[PDB]
C-alpha cells in the first residue's frame, strides 16, 4: 500500500499529477470529494 503514497511523492505531488490532466477544466475546486464511475448506464445497458 505504501507504494501508492511514494509514487505520488515521486511524480511531483497530487497538484502536479492533476495539472497534467483536464482536472482544472472540469470546474471542480478541490480534488477531495470526487470519485470515478466504473461504467455509465449506457455501457451496462448494452453489455448483454
Amino acid at each position: 500500500n505504501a507504494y501508492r503514497t511514494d509514487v505520488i511523492q515521486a511524480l511531483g505531488g497530487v497538484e502536479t499529477i492533476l495539472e497534467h490532466t483536464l482536472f482544472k477544466a472540469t470546474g471542480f475546486p478541490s480534488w477531495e470529494g470526487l470519485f470515478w464511475e466504473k461504467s455509465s448506464g449506457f455501457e451496462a445497458s448494452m453489455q448483454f
Binding site: 477531495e32 470526487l34 470519485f35 470515478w36 464511475e37 466504473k38 448494452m46 453489455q47
Partner: protein, 46 residues
Amino acid sequence: GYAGETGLTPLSKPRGSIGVGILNDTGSDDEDPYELGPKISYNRVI
C-alpha cells in the same frame, strides 16, 4: 411445525478507477492490486 433441514453458509467472505470496459471485464480481473484476498473479519480474542 417443521423447522426443516438447516441450510449452510459460505465460508466467510480519489475513489475508484476508469474501468476496464463492460465486455472486457469478463469477471473481476481487477482486484485490490496491492494485496490478495478478501479482507477477513477478525475476532478480538480466541
